[PDB]
Design a binder for this molecule. Structure first.
Ligand SMILES: O=c1[nH]c(=O)n([C@@H]2O[C@H](COP(=O)(O)O)[C@@H](O)[C@H]2O)cc1F
Ligand SMILES: O=c1[nH]c(=O)n([C@@H]2O[C@H](COP(=O)(O)O)[C@@H](O)[C@H]2O)cc1F
Lengths: 259, 256
C-alpha cells in the first residue's frame, strides 16, 4: 500500500466526492467508523435505535422494504435524527437491473429512495448501465452510490475479475460512486470508501451462509474503512453498550493502522 | 425437443412450472408481459386487455406509485380469470437471512401474491436457501438470473455455470432461469428472456435487443419478456399479438 491518510485528511482530497467528504469529517468528529445495519420490521423501533445509537455511529443502514409500517414521514423523522445526531442514511437496496429500470426504482414508487438516502448500493453484474441510470437521479439530488465489489456470504461469486470490474466501473463513475461494499481494501485511491459487512466480535456465522469476521481483522489487516454490524448489536440486551464496544474496537483498529 | 405440453408432464417438473407450461399450450402463448407502469390503473387495464395473449405478467411492484395489497388482489383475480402467472421481478441479491425477510415481509408481501420471483446468484446459494424457506411452504418458484441483456454484463462464463449448478441443486424451488439463451440441457427448466424487440435496437442506458425469431428460434429460449416493445404502442393488444405469434411460431419451428 502507500502511506495511509486519516479520515480528516481524506475528506479534503481534491478528487473527493461531497457525500464521502461529509461522512469522513463526521467519522473524525465523532470517532466512529461504525455503521449500524438496522434490521427491524417496525418503523418505531428503527427510530428508537437511531435516536439512541446515533452518537455512536457514522451511518445508519436500512432495508426499507422490511419495514411493515413504512411511510415517508418515518423517513422524515429519520432524517431529523440523522441531521441531529449526525450520521448518513444508507439504504441497502442493492440495485441490480438495467439502467432504465434501476432509474425508476431509485426515484419512484412508494419508497422514493433518492429523496432521503444519501447512499445506496448497486451490484455491478448488469454492467455500467446500472450506475449510469442511477446517476441520472442521484446527481440532481446530491447523492452517492456504493458498488458491491465483494460479498461476505459463503459461495459468493464476487471475487477475481468480478471485483476488478466493480473497481473499474467505480473509477469511471467517480462523480457518483463514492466507494464500495467489500471484505477488504479493493481500491488504492483513497477518495474511495470501504465498508465491510459480516462483522462480529466473536467468530461465527448464521444458518444461511453469513460469515463473520472481527473489527480488528476487517479494519486492521484487511484495509476497510467502516464496519457494518447488524445482529451483533441489535440482538444485545444493551444495544448502546454493544454499539460502543464495536465503536471502540473499529476506531482503535483504524488508529493502529495509521501510526 | 419436447413440446410445452410434454414438458409439463416431466417427472422432475415443479408444480408452478407445470401450471405454466400447460396454459402456454392451452393458449399458444410464450409471451411474458413486462408491465413497467407507475399507475396501478394502467397496470390492471393492461392485465385485463392483454391477459389472453400472455402466459406471465412480470411486475416491478416498487415502481408503482399507488401500490396497495388490493391492487394485487384485483391483479390476482385477472390472472385467475385469464390464466397467466405473476412474476415479481424483484431480483433478491442479499444474504440468506435478509432475502427471506424481503421476500415475506414489509409493505410488498411478495410471497402472498407472486407465483414467481427471481434472484441473482452473486451471493451464493444462501440467497436461494433464504427464499426457499418462505417460498416452499406456499408453492412458489424462483428463476435464477444466469445471463443478462445489458452491455458489459458480468453474467458470463463461470458466472453462468454457477447459476446452472445452483439451480440444479435446488430444483425443488428453482423452476428455471432468466437468460439470453438456453443455458441448461435439462428440459425441466424454463428459460425466459428479456431484451426482446422486433426491430434491432437498444436504449440509451445499456439495453440490447434481439428478436423473437433469434431468441426462441436460434438461441433456444422458451419465453420472451417484452416491456417497451408493447407498452409504448398506441395499441398494446395489437402489439402483444404481434409478439405472441412471433414467439409462438418461433417455438413451433424449433420443434420440427
Ligand atoms: O455482503 C453483504 N453482507 C451483508 O450482510 N449485507 C447486509 O448487512 C447486514 C449485516 O447483518 P448482520 O446481522 O450484521 O449479519 C444485513 O442487513 C445484510 O443485508 C450486505 C452485503 F452487501
Ligand atoms: O437481464 C435482464 N434484462 C432485462 O431487460 N430485464 C428486465 O426486463 C424488462 C424488459 O424491458 P424492455 O422494456 O423490454 O427493455 C425490464 O423490466 C427489465 O428490468 C431483466 C433482466 F434480468
Amino acid at each position: 500500500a502507500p502511506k495511509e491518510l486519516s479520515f480528516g485528511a481524506r475528506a479534503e482530497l481534491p478528487r473527493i466526492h461531497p457525500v464521502a467528504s461529509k461522512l469522513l469529517r463526521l467519522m473524525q468528529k465523532k470517532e466512529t467508523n461504525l455503521c449500524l445495519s438496522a434490521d427491524v420490521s417496525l418503523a418505531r423501533e428503527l427510530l428508537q435505535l437511531a435516536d439512541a445509537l446515533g452518537p455512536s455511529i457514522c451511518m445508519l443502514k436500512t432495508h426499507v422494504d422490511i419495514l411493515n409500517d413504512f411511510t415517508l414521514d418515518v423517513m422524515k423523522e429519520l432524517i431529523t435524527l440523522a441531521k441531529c445526531h449526525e450520521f448518513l442514511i444508507f439504504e441497502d437496496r442493492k440495485f441490480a437491473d438495467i439502467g432504465n429500470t434501476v432509474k425508476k426504482q431509485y426515484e419512484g414508487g412508494i419508497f422514493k429512495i433518492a429523496s432521503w438516502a444519501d447512499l445506496v448500493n448497486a451490484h455491478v453484474v448488469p454492467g455500467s448501465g446500472v450506475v449510469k441510470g442511477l446517476q441520472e437521479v442521484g446527481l440532481p439530488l446530491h447523492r452517492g452510490c456504493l458498488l458491491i465489489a465483494e460479498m461476505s456470504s459463503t459461495g459468493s461469486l464476487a471475487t477475481g475479475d468480478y471485483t476488478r470490474a466493480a473497481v473499474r466501473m467505480a473509477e469511471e463513475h467517480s462523480e457518483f460512486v463514492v466507494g464500495f461494499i467489500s471484505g477488504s481494501r479493493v481500491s488504492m485511491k483513497p477518495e474511495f470508501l470501504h465498508l465491510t459487512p459480516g462483522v462480529q466480535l466473536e467468530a461465527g456465522g448464521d444458518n444461511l451462509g453469513q460469515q463473520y469476521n472481527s473489527p480488528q481483522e476487517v479494519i486492521g489487516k484487511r484495509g476497510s474503512d467502516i464496519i457494518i454490524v447488524g445482529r451483533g448489536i441489535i440482538s444485545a440486551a444493551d444495544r448502546l453498550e454493544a454499539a460502543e464496544m464495536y465503536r471502540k474496537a473499529a476506531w482503535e483498529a483504524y488508529l493502529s493502522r495509521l501510526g
